[PDB]
Design a protein around this ligand. Structure first.
Ligand SMILES: *[B@@]1([O])O[C]C2=C1[C]=[C][C]=[C]2
Ligand SMILES: [Cl-]
Ligand code: NA
Ligand code: NA
Length: 261
C-alpha cells in the first residue's frame, strides 16, 4: 500500500506511464503497478531473441559458432559492435553478446533472421507459456513506441514471469541458462537504470531499452546480498514523441520496490 502510493507518486511526477513487476523469490511474492498494461519493449526484446537462439542451440551444438556475414547493407541506426565487423563475419555467440551487452541493432536483426523472423521469436515466447509478448518488427522500426500501438509490446507481469523462467527457471538447458545469465551480467548499458536504484553490493544482470516517446525500460535478474534472487521489470513511456530518456525513473522505481530488503 505504501509501495503503491510511492509508485503512483513517482508516476505522477514523471509525467508518463510507468509499469513495474517485481517477483521476490524469497517468498514467491510480487509487487505490480500497471503490470497487465502493454508497453513497447524496445531493446528489452533482445533477451527473447537471444534466448530463442540459445534454445535452438540445444539441438544444434555448432550453432553458436556459426558465422554470419556483416555487410554495409546490414547497418541500421545503432551498430556499436557490428560497425567494426563490416565485410567480415561474426559468430551467433558474438552477435548474442553484442545484442545483449551493447544493445547492437544489427546483432538483434541477425538473431531475428536466424530463427525465422519476428513471428518465430513470438512463437518461442508462446512455447514458454508467455501469451502476451509480441515481436512484430525488425530493427530499427520496432522501437517507434506509438501510444495505443500494440506492436512490439508486452506487459510487466508477463516479462517478469518469462525472465524468471529464462534466468532462474528451466526454460533453457543448464549451459544455455548460464550463458544467458553470464551475458546479462556483463551488460554495459544498464548502470543508470535498475542498478542505480539498488545498493552497490547487489549483483545485476539486466537488459535496457529505449525508443520513441521517451520510452525507457529495463528488465533485470538481481542477486541481493545474502538474499534469494529477484526479478524486476520497469517500463516507462511518455506522451511526447521526442521526449528524452528518463532512466532516473527506473532507478527510483527499483529503489521503491526493494526498500526494506
Ligand atoms: B534499444 O532500445 O537499446 C538501444 C537502442 C535500441 C533501439 C534503437 C537504438 C538504440
Ligand atoms: Cl550502496
Ligand atoms: Na513478455
Ligand atoms: Na540496471
Amino acid at each position: 500500500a505504501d509501495v503503491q502510493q510511492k509508485l503512483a507518486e513517482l508516476e505522477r511526477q514523471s509525467g508518463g506511464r510507468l509499469g513495474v513487476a517485481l517477483i521476490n523469490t524469497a517468498d514467491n511474492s510480487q509487487i505490480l503497478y500497471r503490470a497487465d498494461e502493454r508497453f513497447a519493449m524496445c531493446s528489452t526484446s533482445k533477451v527473447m531473441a537471444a534466448a530463442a537462439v540459445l534454445k535452438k542451440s540445444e539441438s544444434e551444438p555448432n550453432l553458436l559458432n556459426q558465422r554470419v556475414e556483416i555487410k554495409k547493407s546490414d547497418l541500421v541506426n545503432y551498430n556499436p559492435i557490428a560497425e567494426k565487423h563490416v565485410n567480415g563475419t561474426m559468430s551467433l555467440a558474438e552477435l548474442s553478446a553484442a545484442a545483449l551487452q551493447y544493445s547492437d541493432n544489427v546483432a538483434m536483426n541477425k538473431l531475428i533472421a536466424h530463427v525465422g523472423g519476428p513471428a518465430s521469436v513470438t512463437a518461442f515466447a508462446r512455447q514458454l507459456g508467455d501469451e502476451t509478448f509480441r515481436l512484430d518488427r525488425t530493427e530499427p522500426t520496432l522501437n517507434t513506441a506509438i501510444p495505443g500501438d500494440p506492436r512490439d509490446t508486452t506487459s510487466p507481469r508477463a516479462m517478469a514471469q518469462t525472465l524468471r523462467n529464462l534466468t532462474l527457471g528451466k526454460a533453457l538447458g543448464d549451459s544455455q541458462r548460464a550463458q544467458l545469465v553470464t551475458w546479462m551480467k556483463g551488460n554495459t548499458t544498464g548502470a543508470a537504470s535498475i542498478q542505480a536504484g539498488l545498493p552497490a553490493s547487489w549483483v545485476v544482470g539486466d537488459k535496457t531499452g529505449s525508443g520513441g516517446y521517451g520510452t525507457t525500460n529495463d528488465i533485470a535478474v538481481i542477486w541481493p546480498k545474502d538474499r534469494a534472487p529477484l526479478i524486476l521489470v520497469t517500463y516507462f513511456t511518455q506522451p511526447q514523441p521526442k521526449a528524452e530518456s528518463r532512466r532516473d525513473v527506473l532507478a527510483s522505481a527499483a529503489k521503491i520496490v526493494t526498500d526494506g530488503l
